[PDB]
Amino acid sequence: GETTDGVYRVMTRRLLGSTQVGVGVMQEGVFHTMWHVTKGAALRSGEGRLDPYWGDVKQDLVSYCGPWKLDAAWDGLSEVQLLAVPPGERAKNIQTLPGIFKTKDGDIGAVALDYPAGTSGSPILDKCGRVIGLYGNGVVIKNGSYVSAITQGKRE
Amino acid sequence: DMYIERAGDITWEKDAEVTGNSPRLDVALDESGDFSLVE
Numbered sequence A: 001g002e003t004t005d006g007v008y009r010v011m012t013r014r015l016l017g018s019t020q021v022g023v024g025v026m027q028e029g030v031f032h033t034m035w036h037v038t039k040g041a042a043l044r045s046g047e048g049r050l051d052p053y054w055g056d057v058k059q060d061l062v063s064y065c066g067p068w069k070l071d072a073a074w075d076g077l078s079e080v081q082l083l084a085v086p087p088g089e090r091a092k093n094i095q096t097l098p099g100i101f102k103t104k105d106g107d108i109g110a111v112a113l114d115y116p117a118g119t120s121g122s123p124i125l126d127k128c129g130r131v132i133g134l135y136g137n138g139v140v141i142k143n144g145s146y147v148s149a150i151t152q153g154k155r156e
Numbered sequence B: 001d002m003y004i005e006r007a008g009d010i011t012w013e014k015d016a017e018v019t020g021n022s023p024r025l026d027v028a029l030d031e032s033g034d035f036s037l038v039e
Ligand SMILES: CC(C)Nc1nc2ccccc2[nH]1
Pocket: A114, A115, A116, A117, A118, A119, A120, A135, A136, A137, A140, A144, A145, A146
């Protein structure tokens, strides 16, 4: 199927009509998404099949066709852009200054932008266009609003 | 059955819409990959 670098919607025909369950990144012939989007199932790209290659429920990440390729990191200072791909809507860049998730194992950047759950897997970018992580695994705060981690994998 | 469809190129947009706050939150990550707020 299509292997050109870029952002892709992840769809299913299982429920009513065609439903967007998430989003992902194609880079260097490897498709990258969050685990909760596909649950590790195989994907179709036209008449081609993408098989899972690596995954981890705790990191909430999965790669198809090859190992995880994305290794850029948020510098901890600068604004970033969420390249939001919402269901039934055009891809749109939103610039924001990340907050931080503090954990017993270290700190991680977080973006406070709320989109439908089917937007999970949209990439977050730095100023050179590099993917520093994927949006869609996070928490609900007092006001009921959503805050996502900037979730990044490790390039082996 | 799940399938993928191209949605765009990955680029930084000059003068994109600028929004969102920058909260500092204490969180925990469990074995199931779920984040929870710690207070
Ligand atoms: C506060 C809730 C209803 N909003 C919400 N939950 C999400 C989960 C994953 C990605 C985006 C999401 N937006």
